[PDB]
Design a protein around this ligand. Structure first.
Ligand SMILES: [Zn+2]
Ligand SMILES: [Zn+2]
Ligand SMILES: [Zn+2]
Ligand SMILES: [Zn+2]
Lengths: 6, 697, 697, 6
């Protein structure tokens, strides 16, 4: 899922 | 195709957009506060968009997952059941830290940023502090108009700086989430994969005060009235059709030293993936016996899962396209080109060498730095250390307080402490502390930290147990105690007997020194990074390649067409999935357990006026050659006429390695079709009131 | 599409043929001894075709595997290395039992066969004997011209009978086989699967005596000069193009009672697959320590693997389409229909009830019958039982001898006894006898055979061990002892102390009684089957479904177009594979270990003038919607002008269950492109002399 | 492989 990682 | 193009690059892509099929003029798109671009908003880490004049916002389920989880309990589990507010007064708060940022203005500040940096002189630490001081003054001036938040972005290694100003909406409420078996159909098994069959959407509503100005949650607030919103397509999207996305991709590293790539591939990704999987297994096991642990840790588990699978995907992709090899060969080609310009190439060559030495410096302490940071990010130690740091910072004048700890950050800090209530169980957090202590003890002597060694008083399981038993006496487990400490002064921290607080006080001087070291390396980076990166861009240009900055959380545009891809000889993925594909994956067990209304509607071929005759069904998800990354979840997908045809939500397995080396043949966006949103909200988890408000009911 | 059409059905499929793209007239295709249909030959279990005026014959690698294996030794392994005769005098014998059957004439004899059956009255055994006598007499008349073999075929449950007469060529020689890593690329992992990348081809040459008549092998024999042979296509084959296959499909069960389906799905297939897997595992382990066992058991192992995987495929296919449910539901529908015609539908209901009772009778002894059959199929027991039975039959005049034991059968019996030399190792066979005895003693009392219980003297590991030790004394392990007993008389068998022989004399009476029981049961089927199957066909026609008979080893035509299939939503298999796909599967380990000359040719894009532009490479294998089954391996695929475009060799995974319930969406043939044959024989394992002979060098 | 079984 293309949510922001950190 | 390739590129996360900044808005100022529109003239350069106007031709390509028209050729790919855009029918609006490029001027219409270049108006970032007009129709349709002014409808697109940032959530912090995701994108979304207004879709009604009454403040209704659509994004992905995974972007709203935190909000849904904050409103769920073991007995009333919204993640499982969905949520539907029949009237706007039934909408629940998405939580105090939920935000909608509405773009207001962008300003180039390159010249001033660079002047401030040069005035610092030769000292690396002073250079970082000059930039920080410059940013803080610029932001304070910008945020003098109440209700706005501003952000300074650095592009292309520090070759350009732009200031964004956004209206900051602070009362965001959950209006609709489909049931989890639709919103996250296929769970972690289908995550990062195609074929995909996931209804990845949810709705918020933005609220402001009666004066029209942003305010925190309050029952006197009313719906925001956006200047622009999107409309659903009236023309059926098909294979080959033009599509474009606007959103806020967070991070890419396509401009990178080979050695940076090598460190990430060989250490950073595998290390983090392993730690995340270890923690997933503990929490999974614990949640199977305790439905409160299960719901309270669901959002945390969703990120650990998503991130660790993404990292696995990248490592596999690197091996698929020989990325190490490509990075090495490319670097050798650039260093060659520089050497061949003699004198003129020398400064980029020197900068390369300086960047490489800085990478080695950070490499020398990586195991320590990572282990300490993740140890300190468990709930009680993270709370203690954050709050004790805030107490130190509050004794300084605001303009000198560390960013994250100024007055403008207090709302977020406070909100975080309240949200935690719905994300913390002591018995679970104790297993997580134990995991991190066990990892800490395996560090070699030279990566250990005196203050933690001392506090631990031992190097074995018995010591680990005695520290855990000590920490268990903390009172930081309640929201009221965390808020008491939020308001208290430094001397009160330093006097406490709360053992989590005592840990924070003991380790703080060490965290502050590690911080200074990082700011120092960062100041040497400020000097070297722009010079090398400008050289990489100049070389890419002489090779005729696309030149656009790596992602950095600011607004970008990407465009292309609906198409599949070929993962191996003898096969192709088609551009769409269909209703019948959803039912074919049904097992009756999580994550393949669709609502019975979905299974009934499909069996009865109740298509709801939404069938695309060309595929024989209602479309579910689709593939396209747009260039997106983390942060673009939730972004609206627009057709040739600027109408909504979907939301961006994922990438296919082979795409994730494009964060480092772009592969056009297998990089695709996965989006959820606007028609499947509408279908679910007609036939499966009905929200007629929302369909009416968006003029499609 | 669907259908294995007999050639007498050409008027019905003439329109459909033209519509699908056939450009030859149907009259031309109706001429079964003409151009090109006269080029197509039967191998007995596989199909082939002439491709030169000097007797060159092309078929599949799996069809020639037996011949290749016979000519292989551990030190000169043609399976692994390939074979190439520079001149015809270099060609090696394919074995004494190898045949090429060239169609001469077909005759309807339906009316005569049903009379002869009717004349035996209401006696089931007598009915079988009467059909046998009529067949033997008919064949004897037809075979009076020297060089011909005739066969009687029953179609549609005995509604039609036809006599085929074939020129029987009995000196067949191997001319070319590609290395096994090409001819069987992917081995058992890719078998029954797509995407497929297999060079599934091989060549024989047919020989006759100097006077033109057939003859067993002799250096005095010359190449046969066929009247017709195929020509390779000059137009490139592409997606959508018309293709047709003519060949010898063996068996289908599309007209079948539901209970026949259920017995096959729940017992026959799983039982056989299990037993074949156990034997594979044994022979596999022994062959890892013993190259002689590995080469000698290779053809037997290829069979076991192929049949067991086919059966696993059919079972999975049944689950996928709910075959049990479909068979149940169409049975109800047929029986409903018959009752609804009251008077006129009574004969079929009676038949159905009879056929159903016959099934249950087989079912009573299924375990006994299969276990005894496979036990007696091990090498020394098979030889001894066969040879003893022959001595018994030779005592009777030739017209009364059981089929398979008449004079016309002597060549094949003798040939098999010689061929067994290249396929038998005592130490391996003992383990197979052991396996089967262990399975026999597992059988319950009511499934036992008295004569075998006695010969064994107990039901324990000790009796087995003793039985094996006794059988180890046989002298039938040499080709010369076997041929000695081929000539000996019954009395000599009855006097012998060879323990394999003593076994056979001991059990033969039981085997003769079982045989009578089977012929009696077949005589009853012969009354009832034709009536009921005629009714299934009437029902099918009344529902507008395609009507053609189940396969029975006679010549059939199937036709359609080059196309992929969609195994799952969101994906499609494309019609062609390509060279680049062969190399992507390379691992350097069997079965994915192509020859170096192949890997190099592909890397250097040496496409040899055979590239198809629309796929950007030389095509390897392709899919089409033709309807083939076991026996069609080796059939020529012809284009719209009757030219050779490939060889049929397999089915995709989801196709195999069509043996019982035809599924159009998932039923495809896998063929090897004639361009890949050519490409291999130019660039990989060269045979410029064979290319020249086929006018493509 | 589409060879005849048995
Ligand atoms: Zn307190
Ligand atoms: Zn238009
Ligand atoms: Zn033509
Ligand atoms: Zn002897």
């Amino acid at each position: 899922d293309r949510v922001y990682i950190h | 195709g390739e590129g996360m193009w900044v808005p100022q690059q529109l003239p350069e892509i106007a031709g390509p957009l028209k050729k790919a099929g855009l029918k609006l003029s490029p001027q219409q798109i270049s108006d970032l506060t007009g129709d349709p671009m002014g409808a697109v908003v940032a959530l912090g880490g995701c994108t979304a968009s207004f879709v009604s004049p009454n403040g209704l916002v659509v994004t992905n389920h995974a972007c709203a997952y935190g909000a849904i989880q904050l409103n769920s309990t073991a007995e009333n589990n919204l993640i499982k059941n969905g949520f539907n507010a029949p009237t706007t007064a039934d909408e629940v708060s998405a939580g105090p830290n939920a935000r909608v940022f509405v773009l207001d203005e962008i300003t180039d500040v390159t010249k001033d940023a660079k002047a401030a940096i040069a005035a610092a002189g030769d000292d690396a630490l002073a250079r970082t502090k000059a930039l920080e001081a410059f940013e803080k003054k610029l932001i304070a001036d910008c945020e003098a108009e109440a209700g706005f938040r501003c952000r300074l972005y650095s592009f292309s290694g520090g070759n350009t700086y732009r200031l964004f100003k956004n209206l900051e909406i602070k009362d965001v409420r959950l209006a609709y989430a489909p049931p989890g078996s639709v919103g996250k159909f296929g769970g972690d098994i289908d995550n990062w994969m195609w074929p995909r069959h996931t209804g990845a959407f949810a709705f918020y509503r933005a609220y402001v005060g009666k004066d029209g100005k942003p305010a925190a949650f309050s029952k006197d607030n009313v719906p925001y009235q956006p200047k622009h919103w999107l409309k659903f397509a009236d023309q059926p999207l098909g294979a080959g059709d033009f599509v474009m996305v606007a959103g806020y991709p967070g991070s890419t590293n396509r401009y990178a030293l080979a050695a940076e790539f090598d460190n990430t591939a060989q250490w950073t990704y595998p290390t983090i993936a392993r730690h995340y999987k270890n923690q997933i297994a503990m929490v999974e096991a614990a949640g199977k016996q305790n439905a409160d642990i299960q719901v309270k840790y669901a959002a945390t588990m969703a990120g650990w899962n998503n991130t660790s699978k993404n990292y696995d995907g990248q490592l596999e992709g690197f091996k698929r396209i020989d990325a190490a090899g490509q990075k090495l060969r490319e670097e050798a080609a650039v260093l060659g080109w520089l050497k061949g310009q003699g004198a003129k190439g020398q400064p980029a060559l020197d900068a390369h060498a300086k960047l490489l030495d800085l990478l080695e410096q950070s490499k020398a302490t990586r195991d320590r730095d990572l282990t300490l940071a993740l140890f300190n990010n468990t709930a009680m130690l993270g709370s203690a250390t954050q709050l004790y740091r805030l107490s130190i910072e509050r004794e300084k004048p605001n303009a000198e307080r560390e960013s994250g700890y100024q007055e403008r950050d207090l709302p977020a800090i406070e909100g975080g402490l309240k949200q935690l209530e719905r994300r913390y169980v002591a018995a679970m957090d104790r297993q997580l502390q134990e995991y991190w202590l066990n990892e800490y003890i395996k560090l070699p002597a030279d990566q250990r930290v005196a203050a933690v060694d001392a506090w631990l008083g031992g190097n074995d399981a018995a010591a680990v147990k005695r520290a855990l038993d000590r920490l268990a006496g903390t009172k930081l487990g309640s929201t009221e105690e965390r808020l008491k400490w939020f308001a208290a002064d430094r001397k009160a921290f330093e006097a406490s007997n709360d053992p989590a607080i005592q840990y924070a006080v003991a380790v703080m001087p060490t965290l502050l020194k590690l911080e200074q070291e990082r700011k120092t390396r960062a100041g040497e980076n400020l000097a070297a990074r722009p010079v090398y990166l400008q050289a990489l861009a100049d070389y890419k240009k002489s090779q005729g390649e696309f030149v656009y900055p790596d992602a950095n959380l600011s607004l970008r545009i990407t465009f292309g067409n609906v198409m599949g891809y070929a993962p191996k000889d003898g096969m192709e993925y088609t551009p769409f999935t269909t209703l019948e594909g959803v039912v074919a994956k049904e097992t009756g067990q999580d994550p393949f357990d669709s609502p019975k209304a979905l299974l009934d509607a499909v069996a009865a071929k109740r298509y709801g006026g939404l069938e695309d005759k060309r595929i024989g069904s209602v479309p579910v998800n689709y593939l396209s050659d747009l260039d997106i990354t983390g942060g673009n979840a939730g972004s609206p997908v627009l057709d040739a006429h600027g109408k909504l045809v979907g939301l961006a939500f994922d990438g296919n397995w082979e795409s994730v390695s494009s964060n480092w080396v772009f592969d056009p043949k297998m990089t695709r966006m996965i989006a959820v079709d606007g028609r499947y949103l509408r279908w679910i909200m007609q036939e499966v988890y009905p929200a007629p009131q929302l369909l009416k408000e968006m003029n499609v009911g």
